[PDB]
Amino acid sequence: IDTAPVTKMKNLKTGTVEVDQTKLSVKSWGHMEPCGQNKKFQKRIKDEAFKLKKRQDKYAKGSAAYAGVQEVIDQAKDTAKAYEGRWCGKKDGLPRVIATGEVTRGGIVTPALMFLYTTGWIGYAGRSYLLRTKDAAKEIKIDVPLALTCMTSAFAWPVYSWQDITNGRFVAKDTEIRVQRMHMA
Amino acid sequence: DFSKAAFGSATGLVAKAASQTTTAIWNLHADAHDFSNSSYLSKQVFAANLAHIGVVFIWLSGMHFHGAYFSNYLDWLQDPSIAPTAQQVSNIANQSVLNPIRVTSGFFNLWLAEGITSTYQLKVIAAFGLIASALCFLGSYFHMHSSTSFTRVLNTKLTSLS
Amino acid sequence: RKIPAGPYSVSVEPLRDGATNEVSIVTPPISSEGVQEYLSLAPVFFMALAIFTSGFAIEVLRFFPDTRYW
Amino acid sequence: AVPNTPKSSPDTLAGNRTEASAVSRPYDKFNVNYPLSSPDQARTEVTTKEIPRPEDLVDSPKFPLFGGSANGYMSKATRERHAITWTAKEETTFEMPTSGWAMMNKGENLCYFRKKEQCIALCKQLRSMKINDVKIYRLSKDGTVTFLHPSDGVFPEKVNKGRVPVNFRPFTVCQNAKQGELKFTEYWTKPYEADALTTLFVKARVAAYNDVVNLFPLPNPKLTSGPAEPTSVDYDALTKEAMEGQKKRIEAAMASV
Amino acid sequence: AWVGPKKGSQVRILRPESYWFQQRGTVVNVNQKTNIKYPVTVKFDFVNYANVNTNGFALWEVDELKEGEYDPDL
Amino acid sequence: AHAVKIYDTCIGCTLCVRACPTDVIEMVPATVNAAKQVASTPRVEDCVGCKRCETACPTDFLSIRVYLQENEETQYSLGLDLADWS
Amino acid sequence: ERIPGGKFTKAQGKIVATPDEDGFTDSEVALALIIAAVVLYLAIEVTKSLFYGEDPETTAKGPMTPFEKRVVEKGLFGSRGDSYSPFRP
Ligand code: CLA
Ligand code: CLA
Ligand code: CLA
Ligand SMILES: CC1=C(/C=C/C(C)=C/C=C/C(C)=C/C=C/C=C(C)/C=C/C=C(C)/C=C/C2=C(C)CCCC2(C)C)C(C)(C)CCC1
Ligand code: SF4
Numbered sequence: 002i003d004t005a006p007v008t009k010m011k012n013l014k015t016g017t018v019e020v021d022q023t024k025l026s027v028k029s030w031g032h033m034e035p036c037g038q039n040k041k042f043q044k045r046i047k048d049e050a051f052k053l054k055k056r057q058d059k060y061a062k063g064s065a066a067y068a069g070v071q072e073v074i075d076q077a078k079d080t081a082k083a084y085e086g087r088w089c090g091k092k093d094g095l096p097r098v099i100a101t102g103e104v105t106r107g108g109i110v111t112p113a114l115m116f117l118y119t120t121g122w123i124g125y126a127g128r129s130y131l132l133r134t135k136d137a138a139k140e141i142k143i144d145v146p147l148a149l150t151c152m153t154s155a156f157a158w159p160v161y162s163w164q165d166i167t168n169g170r171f172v173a174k175d176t177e178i179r180v181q182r183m184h185m186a
Numbered sequence: 187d188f189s190k191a192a193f194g195s196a197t198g199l200v201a202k203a204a205s206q207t208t209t210a211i212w213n214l215h216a217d218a219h220d221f222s223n224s225s226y227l228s229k230q231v232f233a234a235n236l237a238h239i240g241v242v243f244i245w246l247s248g249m250h251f252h253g254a255y256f257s258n259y260l261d262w263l264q265d266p267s268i269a270p271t272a273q274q275v276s277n278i279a280n281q282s283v284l285n286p287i288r289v290t291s292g293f294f295n296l297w298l299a300e301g302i303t304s305t306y307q308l309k310v311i312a313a314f315g316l317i318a319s320a321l322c323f324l325g326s327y328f329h330m331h332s333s334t335s336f337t338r339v340l341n342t343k344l345t346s347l348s
Numbered sequence: 349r350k351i352p353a354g355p356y357s358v359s360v361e362p363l364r365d366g367a368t369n370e371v372s373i374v375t376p377p378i379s380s381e382g383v384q385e386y387l388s389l390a391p392v393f394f395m396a397l398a399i400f401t402s403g404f405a406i407e408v409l410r411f412f413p414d415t416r417y418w
Numbered sequence: 419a420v421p422n423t424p425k426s427s428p429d430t431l432a433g434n435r436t437e438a439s440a441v442s443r444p445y446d447k448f449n450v451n452y453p454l455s456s457p458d459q460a461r462t463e464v465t466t467k468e469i470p471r472p473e474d475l476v477d478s479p480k481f482p483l484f485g486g487s488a489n490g491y492m493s494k495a496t497r498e499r500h501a502i503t504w505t506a507k508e509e510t511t512f513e514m515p516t517s518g519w520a521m522m523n524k525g526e527n528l529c530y531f532r533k534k535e536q537c538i539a540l541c542k543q544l545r546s547m548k549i550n551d552v553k554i555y556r557l558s559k560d561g562t563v564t565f566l567h568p569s570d571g572v573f574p575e576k577v578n579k580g581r582v583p584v585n586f587r588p589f590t591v592c593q594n595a596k597q598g599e600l601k602f603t604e605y606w607t608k609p610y611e612a613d614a615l616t617t618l619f620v621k622a623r624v625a626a627y628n629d630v631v632n633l634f635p636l637p638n639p640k641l642t643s644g645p646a647e648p649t650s651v652d653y654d655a656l657t658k659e660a661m662e663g664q665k666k667r668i669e670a671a672m673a674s675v
Numbered sequence: 676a677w678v679g680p681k682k683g684s685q686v687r688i689l690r691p692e693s694y695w696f697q698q699r700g701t702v703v704n705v706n707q708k709t710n711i712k713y714p715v716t717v718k719f720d721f722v723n724y725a726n727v728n729t730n731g732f733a734l735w736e737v738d739e740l741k742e743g744e745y746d747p748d749l
Numbered sequence: 750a751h752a753v754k755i756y757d758t759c760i761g762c763t764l765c766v767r768a769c770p771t772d773v774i775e776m777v778p779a780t781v782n783a784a785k786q787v788a789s790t791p792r793v794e795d796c797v798g799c800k801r802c803e804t805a806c807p808t809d810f811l812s813i814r815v816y817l818q819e820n821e822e823t824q825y826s827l828g829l830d831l832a833d834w835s
Numbered sequence: 836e837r838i839p840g841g842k843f844t845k846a847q848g849k850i851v852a853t854p855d856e857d858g859f860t861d862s863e864v865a866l867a868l869i870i871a872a873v874v875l876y877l878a879i880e881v882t883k884s885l886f887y888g889e890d891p892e893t894t895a896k897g898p899m900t901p902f903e904k905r906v907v908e909k910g911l912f913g914s915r916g917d918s919y920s921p922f923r924p
Binding site for chain 2: 351356358414
C-alpha cells in the first residue's frame, strides 16, 4: 500500500525566483553526462557488440556474410567512438539532442541552420521557377534548363529573399490577390 | 512523332484551361487504362495484355535471378529444414539485422519440383525470362502499332479463340 | 486508311496488290526533340529528382554512417 | 390474387393518408397554380376519360410492348400515378425508367409510373430519339388528372409568352441578407426568402448600427409606477440635435452620390 | 459612345463572391445595352471549380486597369 | 419542399432546365440578359434537391440556388417510390 | 467471495468488506422513494409546462413585478440583451 513517488516542491515564499547563470549549460546539468563515462551507455555498446558478434558467429570464417557482419561491427565501433562525445542522461545512456540553442555536441543550431538554408533554397528555386514560368504548360512540362538554372541560382536565397521582402517584390498587396471577402467585408 | 504522342495526354491537359488543375492529373491517372470505345479498342486491349505478360516475365526473371545469386538454394537443397532466404539486404542505414530475409513464396519448393539443382539453371531461367519479356514487349508494341484490329476475337472469332 | 488501324501506326495499308518489295520500318518514329520533351515531364523530371536525392542520401549514409559528426 | 397482391383496395390500405398528411406535413401543399406560373395561363384541363387511372386499363392498345417487371409502382400500396402520353413515328425499343426494355407502338403510347422523375427521364430519352408531344400527367387518389411537363404547351427549354418569373431574386446570390441581420424575423433561418426591400433595409440597418457616433441612445422606458426620474439629460434637446445631425448627414451622403 | 471597359483590357474583379475576386481578367466584350445588368464579359486564365473561365460582370463590379499599373505576376 | 431561387446573374442558358429530372425550372421572358430569357422555378414542389441544375449553371457562382430544407421533406422531395402520402 | 482480477488488486491486497447489515433498512428506502415520487410529480409538471411552451397571455396579461419592471427599465440581470449568461458579471 503506497502511492506514486511523491516529489518535493520549493516552498518559494522568499518573493524572488533565482535562476542560476552557471546552470545554463549542458556541462553543468546533473541529469546528463557525456557518453564517454556513462556506465549505462557503455553497457549498451557492449551489448550491441556482443549481439553483433553472436550474429557473426552464425556464418563461417571468410564467407561474404562474415565480412558483411564484420563491416557492421567496425561501423558500430566507430559509431560508439564518435558518440562518446555526446550527452546521454545518467540512467538511460541514449545520447540526447540539446535544443536550448547552445552550440554543443549533438546540438540543434547547426542542423537547424543547414536545414533552413537547404529548404529556403528549395522553396526559392520553386518560387523563382513559378515566377519565370507563369504558365501551366511550363508547370506540367518542366523547362529543364530554366528549372536547373533556378535551382542552382537559388543558392543566394537568404539575402535575395530579404531584399525582395524589404523592397516589396516578395509579398503581394492584399488588395491584388484572391482574398476571402465573400462576407462582403 | 510517336515520342510527341507519348506525352500527348499531358499536352492535351495543358492545352485547355479547364484541364489545368490537379484534378485533371488525377483524372489522367484514373482514366489511364480506361481504353475508350474506338476502332482500335481490341488492339489496345490485346497489346496491354501482352505488355502485362512481359511485366510478369520480368518479375519471374527477377525471382529466378535472386534464387541464383541472392539465395541459399543449394543449402536448402542439402537441408530442406533450413530457412529459405532469397533476398540479401545491404548494410545501409542500420538495416543489417534483417540481412537474410526468409522468403515465403515457395520458389525453392517449386524449383525442386522442376528438377532445378544448380544455380546456373536459375541464371539460365532468369536470362530466358528476360528474353521472353523482351519478346512480349516487342509483340505488344507490334500489336498496338502494326497488326490486325482484333475486333473479331470476342464475337466473330470467339470459336477460334476458345 | 480504310482498314481500321490505331492512331500512331507503323503499319502499311493492308490493301496492297501483288507482293511488294517495300521498306516498312517497324520502329517507332520517335524524335530527339520529342524524347527530350518527354523526359522533361513533371512526373519524369520530379521522379528523377527524387531518385537523385534518394541516391545522394544513400551515398552520404554509406560513406558517413550515422550522425557521427553531430 | 390474394398472395400476389393484398386483397383490400388501395383506398382501404391507404386508411387516412389524407387528413393525416394535412396534419403530419402541413407545409406539404401545392400553390394555387401548380403546373403553371401565372393564374392567367390557359390551364388546360383533362379528365379521367382522357387519361384513366392504371387500375381501370387492362391490355390497353396504347400501352407499349412491355413485359412487366418488379420495378414498377406499388399497386394497392400507393395511389399516386404519373402517366406519359407520347405519339411515335415508328415502333422501336426504349429503356423503361424502371429498368427493363419496352417497345413503342406505331401510333399513340401510354405508360404509367409512380414518380414524376421516371416520367421526365423517359421524356428526355424520347426527345433524344426525336419525339415531340410528350405529355406527362399526374393521377391522384380520387382520379383527378393534372397535366404537367409541357404545362403551357411549350417545353420549358424554350421560352414562351405568358410565363411569369417565379422565385426570381433581383440581385446576386451573395447579396442575400445574412441570418444575423434577419434575426427575430420570419426570414431568420431562410434569408433567401426575404424580399429585396427587406434585404436592402437590413443591410443598411447593420451599417447604421456601426455608427455609434451618430446612433441614437433610444431612452429607457418608463415602467416603474413611481414618478419620472428627474435625471440630468434633456431628451428633447438630444432629439432636436439628432434631427439636425440626421438632416446634415443625409444631405452630405446624397451629395457624395 | 462606348461605356464600360475597353475590349481586351485587363480588369480587376470587384465582385466579392466571384472565384476571381480581386484577381485580373481580360474583357471579351461589353454589351452596349442599358438594360443588361451584367454586360462586361471577362475571360480569365484560371478556371473556377465549374471548369469555366468566362463570366459576365456588372459595370460596377470591374475595375479597368491601365497597361502597366497592375502586377504582371498576379 | 427545397426552395429553389433564380438571381439576376442568370444568362438564359436553358442548361438548368435541361438538367432538371423533375421539370422544376422553366424559361420565362425577361429584359435583364442578352438572351432575353431567365430561368424560373414555378414547380418547386417537384424539386428533389439533386442540384443537377447547379451543376449545369455556367456563371461564376450559381445563378440558380437550391436550398435544401430537411425540416420540410415531401414525398416528391424525398423521391419516394413505394410509399404514398397523398 | 470474489476472484481477483488485475495486478493492483492482488498486489495491494484490498478486500471488499461487505457491511454486516444493509445500511438503509427498508423504512428509509421507502421515504426516499416517496420523496422521489414527489420529485417525479414535479418533473411531470415541468415536462407538461415545457412541451406546450409558455402560453402567450402570461408575460403579457400578468403585469411584471416592480422588481421586473425596474430591471427591464434599467437593463439588468441579462435584460437589455438576448442572452442567458448565468455567469453575467
Ligand atoms: C514552389 C514551391 C512551393 C513553395 C515556395 C511553397 C511555399 C509555402 N508553402 Mg507549399 N506546397 C507546395 C509547394 C510549395 N510551397 C506543394 C507542391 C504542395 C503540395 C504538397 C504544397 C502544400 C502546402 C500546404 C498544405 C501548406 C503549404 C504551406 C506553405 C507556406 C509555408 C512553408 C511550408 O509549410 O512549406 C511546407 C511544404 C510542404 C508541406 C509541401 C512541400 C512539397 C514540395 C517539397 C514542394 C515543391 C517544391 C517545388 C516542386 C520545387 C521545384 C523547383 C523546380 C520546378 C525548379 C509557404 C508559403 C503552408 C502554409 O500555407 O503556411 C502558411 C501549408 O499549410 N504548402
Ligand atoms: C485482370 C484484371 C483487371 C483488369 C485488366 C482491369 C482493368 C480495368 N479496370 Mg479494374 N478491377 C480489377 C481487375 C482488373 N481491372 C479488380 C480485381 C478490381 C477490384 C479490386 C477492379 C476494380 C475496378 C474499379 C473500381 C474500376 C476499375 C477500372 C478499370 C479500367 C481502368 C483501370 C485504370 O485506369 O486503372 C489505372 C491504374 C491504376 C489506378 C493503378 C493505381 C494503383 C492502385 C490504385 C493501387 C495499387 C497499390 C499497390 C498494390 C500497393 C503499392 C505497394 C506498396 C508497398 C506501397 C480497366 C478496364 C475503372 C473503370 O472505370 O473501368 C472502366 C474503375 O473505376 N476496376
Ligand atoms: C526495399 C524494400 C523491399 C524490396 C525492394 C523487396 C523486394 C522483394 N521482396 Mg521483400 N521484404 C521487404 C522489403 C522489400 N522487398 C521487407 C521489409 C520484408 C519484411 C521482412 C520483406 C519480406 C519478403 C518476403 C517474406 C518475401 C519477399 C519477396 C520479395 C521479392 C518479390 C517481389 C515483390 O516484393 O513483389 C511485389 C509486391 C509488392 C510491392 C507488394 C504486394 C502487396 C503486399 C504483399 C501486401 C502488403 C504490403 C506491405 C508489405 C505492407 C506495408 C506497406 C506499407 C504500409 C509500408 C522482391 C525481390 C518474396 C520473394 O520470393 O523474394 C525472392 C518473399 O517471399 N520479401
Ligand atoms: C412503498 C411506498 C409507497 C409507494 C412508493 C412508490 C411507488 C414510490 C415510487 C417512486 C418513484 C416512481 C420515483 C420515480 C422518480 C423519477 C424521477 C424523480 C424522475 C425525475 C426526472 C427528472 C427530474 C427530469 C425530468 C426532465 C427530463 C428528463 C426531460 C424534460 C425536462 C425535465 C428536466 C423535467 C406508498 C406510497 C404506497 C407507501 C409508502 C412507501
Ligand atoms: S444555367 Fe444558370 S445562367 Fe443558364 S439559364 Fe440556367 S440559371 Fe440561368
